[PDB]
Q: What sequence folds into this?
């Protein structure tokens, strides 16, 4: 069996708006197993902070 | 054996014709036209892995 090693990661970066991680190599079904897995993480569970509740004293 | 030995005459003049067979397996791929008996037609866009 043979394996691949992720290389050439051409990070197109703009200060704070967005990062576009270009990267090779991905056989059929890996930009999937990873890409969707990441958006899953980014819409459902990512340990960060936020305001839970706000009481307007007025 | 008679049929095998002298039944090879084909065309006047060109009595020696060499016919060769070339078997070529052709598969299903992005661009094939698949349908059903009922009438519905179709052409495969992108045959995805069974993962999806």
A:
């Amino acid at each position: 069996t043979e394996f691949l090693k992720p290389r050439l990661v051409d990070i197109e970066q703009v200060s704070s708006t967005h990062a576009k991680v270009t990267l090779e190599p991905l056989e059929r079904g890996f930009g999937h197993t990873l890409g969707n897995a990441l958006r899953r993480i980014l819409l459902s569970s990512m340990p960060g902070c936020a305001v839970t509740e706000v009481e307007i004293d007025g | 054996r008679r049929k095998i030995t002298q039944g090879d005459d084909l065309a006047p003049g060109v009595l020696k014709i060499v016919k060769v067979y070339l078997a070529v397996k052709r598969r299903i791929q992005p661009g094939d036209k698949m349908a059903g008996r009922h009438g519905n037609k179709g052409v495969i866009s992108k045959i995805n892995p069974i993962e999806d």
Remarks:
- The interface with chain B takes residues 28-29, 32-33 of chain A (CB under 8 Å).
- The first strand of chain A starts at residue 11 and ends at 14.
- Chain A is about 25% helix and 15% strand.
